[PDB]
């Protein structure tokens, strides 16, 4: 996260860290959506242009974390994966369209002050909250500039109008994405960056006071460049696939 702040303890209890077994390193962020399902970005697992293709056994998920590198004894939980599901029509060849993946945990995780699922948006929440100018929140342990933080970082960013997202890039934008960030002339900055991928873009409903995950940190060009924006996977647009995977497996 670039131009963000240290998160408070327990501020994002759904934040998950994707951790490589060997070499031991941070791969991506992710989010807890139930006691054994974790949502993340497909490109975190499968991206052939960089010879990236991880399987259930290459990975650990670490839940309830705050420090980036410490083993947070008695606080964090570490889980193994049972199965990984990548969207069938994830487009890694062109534009990272449908950049989304589900991960089923070997065993359900127990909730605590530091570990708690986020909600998935219903059609009406999405309709009401996904609007240009509204702000959402992004979190991650990713790079601080286009170097690495000691604790989880947070930044609030406004949703940007569709026409503006399109005119800022040569990449072909789809309905399964939205962009967010400040305009060059708005004075405030901030963006996700490398390592933040797979993390949640969340919003707090003014109606029921619950936090909903609206997007998944997907891609951008550099980090926090003027006239550029972060792009996020549109979670609701892909909810049918999410729901399908879950009640089948």
């Amino acid at each position: 996260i670039v131009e963000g702040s240290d998160a408070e303890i327990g501020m994002s209890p759904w934040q998950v860290m994707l951790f490589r077994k060997s070499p031991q390193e941070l791969l991506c962020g992710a989010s807890l959506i139930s006691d054994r399902w974790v949502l993340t970005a497909a490109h975190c697992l499968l991206y052939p242009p960089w010879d990236k293709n991880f399987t259930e056994n290459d990975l650990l998920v670490r839940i309830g974390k705050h420090s980036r590198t410490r083993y947070e004894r008695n606080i964090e939980k570490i889980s193994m994966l049972e199965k990984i599901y990548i969207h069938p029509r994830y487009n890694w060849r062109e534009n990272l369209d449908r950049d989304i993946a589900l991960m089923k945990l070997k065993k359900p995780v127990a909730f605590s002050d530091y570990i708690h699922p986020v909600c998935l948006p219903d059609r009406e929440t999405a309709a009401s909250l996904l609007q240009a100018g509204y702000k959402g929140r992004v979190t991650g342990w990713g790079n601080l500039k286009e170097g690495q933080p000691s604790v989880l970082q947070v930044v609030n960013l406004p949703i940007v109008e569709r026409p503006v997202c399109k005119d800022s890039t040569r990449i072909r934008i789809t309905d399964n994405m939205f962009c967010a960030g400040y305009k060059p002339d708005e004075g405030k900055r901030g963006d996700a960056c490398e390592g933040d991928s797979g993390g949640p873009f969340v919003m707090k409903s003014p109606f029921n006071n619950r936090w909903y995950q609206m997007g998944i940190v997907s891609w951008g060009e550099g980090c926090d460049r003027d006239g550029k924006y972060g792009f996020y996977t549109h979670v609701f647009r892909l909810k049918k696939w999410i729901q399908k995977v879950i009640d089948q497996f």
Partner: peptide, 11 residues
């Protein structure tokens, strides 16, 4: 850089 995690998980 990262603090070692218990060996059982690296399994």
């Amino acid at each position: 850089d990262f603090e070692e995690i218990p060996e059982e998980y690296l399994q």
